[model samples]
Target chain A: GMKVVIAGRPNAGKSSLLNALAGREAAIVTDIAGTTRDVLREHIHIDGMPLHIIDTAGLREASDEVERIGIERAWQEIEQADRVLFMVDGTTTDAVDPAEIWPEFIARLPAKLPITVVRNKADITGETLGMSEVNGHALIRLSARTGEGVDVLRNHLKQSM
Target chain B: MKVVIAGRPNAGKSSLLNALAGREAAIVTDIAGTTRDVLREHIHIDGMPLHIIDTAGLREASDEVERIGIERAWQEIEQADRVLFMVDGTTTDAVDPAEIWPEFIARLPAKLPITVVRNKADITGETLGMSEVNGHALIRLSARTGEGVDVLRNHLKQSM
Candidate 1:
């Protein structure tokens, strides 16, 4: 099974993205930052290809003891992930420079690990749905809430295997 | 003039909203996540008419009602002419507001006027006056003590 990890800043729709991929509400979706304080796992088959999807807590300067531990766990999961989905809120312009937002996380990623930038919340932004390349990495513009462009993502993952 | 107040929970948004209105326009409490509805007050500053909007504190939450309030808050912000991005002076990290609130700032209309209000100066002991940070106007004020509120009013008045 391929290990896929979802990572992003607080409220970037990590849980919602996971639910869309899993085809069920495997993780809780809420507006509250740090709501997913533990690493959640869901095993799914994308066109008969087994994928071990892991939804981790949103990374940020933790404000509490529990959140600090959760963020630490998120890093650990990312460090070992076979593939990483760097999720961003497409409704905002902050995604223009993700490395600036997560400097330490970007620096610590495994040099050869495959990373795909997932721009979530495209429903609000009204961005054209499709896959493109950004700095040698695949970037997908999709609304996890509306399930648009999700099939493209699933096909991308299947082709990766 | 239309001014919108937005920031994370318990950043003294309601207190500042009441202070600027010169009356109890919105309820203030120590508990975080208060002020779940958009409160609007039309007031005059130095004979200049201004319409102030106090939005619900922005945060990630599980409550359905708070989520709806947060959604509406963003809607109000998009229509605002000017924004007062409030922050808790004492707890805020020693980082530029642009870096601390990239997502919030990025969502604002590009070229829209913004004033970063650092509230709770009476407790933080930060100097109360006008300053500049990351090219945005920064005002250190204590909405609780009414200090520096005049400076804020004068700044807004000058903009008008």
Candidate 2:
């Protein structure tokens, strides 16, 4: 199975993206930050190819011991992932520049690992579903809640394999 | 000092208010939209009187009650002497305050001093301190653990 890991800041819709991709609520979706405190896994077929999708806890300053451990596991999953989907809140002002906002996270990524930047929450921002490139990484603008532009991501993953 | 704390839902507006007040002046919860009314706290910092109001989180309201509360928040903002625009430090990374909430920033009074209070520092492991973003004072602190709360107090006092 192709290992794909979903990663992003808390409340950035990482679980929502996973649920969208999984075509079911494989992970809980919530508006509250730090709601996801563990790494969730779902096995699915992307164009008949088995893909192991991992939904990670939204990376943030952990307020408790459980969240801290969850964040640590998120990093470990990212380190072993075949490809990474780095999601960002499209409604935010700095959605385009993940490196600028989370420099340490970006810098720690394995240089050879394939990365995709996901601009999520298009439903709120009214951004049309599309694909673009930023700094040599594939970028997709989609609303995981609305099922919009999710196919593009699916196809991207399918083709990458 | 006349201060009003405003920000989006679950940005820790109520917690920040409680931390500043040194008591449980407002309800703190993990749920978004938990705060619907404007909460007020009066306290003295170093013998100086301070009046602080915590407003409902500004977001697309799911109910009429929330809509009304958000409207009242704006009214309080207009009448405030100083505005502490609270944000979730772990989630917010915008250098410009307007980038985080453009409409709120645009509606602020021209002469009113705005301080960007980035709360939840204890979770993010961010160094507690004061910084500048787009010429506005940005203070990183944890309303839960009370770390760097004094920096916010000192900054508020200095702005007086």
For all candidates, what are the clash counts? 5, 3
Over B1-160, each residue of candidate 2 has an lDDT whose tens digit, in order, gives 6799998899999888889988755657786765555666788888789889887799889755467668878888988999999989778677478888888799789989999988898888888989998899999899899899898898888888
TM-score of each: 0.50, 0.50
- Which stretches of model 2 miss by more than 4 angstroms? B1-160
Error of 2 at B93 (Å): 54
Docking class of 1: incorrect
| Model 1 TM | 0.50
For model 2, how many clashes? 3
Which pairs of residues have clashing backbones in candidate 1? A31-B60, A31-B61, A32-B60, A32-B61, A33-B60
What DockQ values do the models have? Answer: 0.01, 0.01
lDDT of 1 by residue, B17-82 (tens): 889988755657676655554666788887889889887789886766467668868887888889
Top candidate when judged by lDDT against the true structure: 2
lDDT of 1 by residue, A43-159 (tens): 889878899888887888987555576678788889999999999888766464456446677778999888888888888988888888776778898998889999989998998
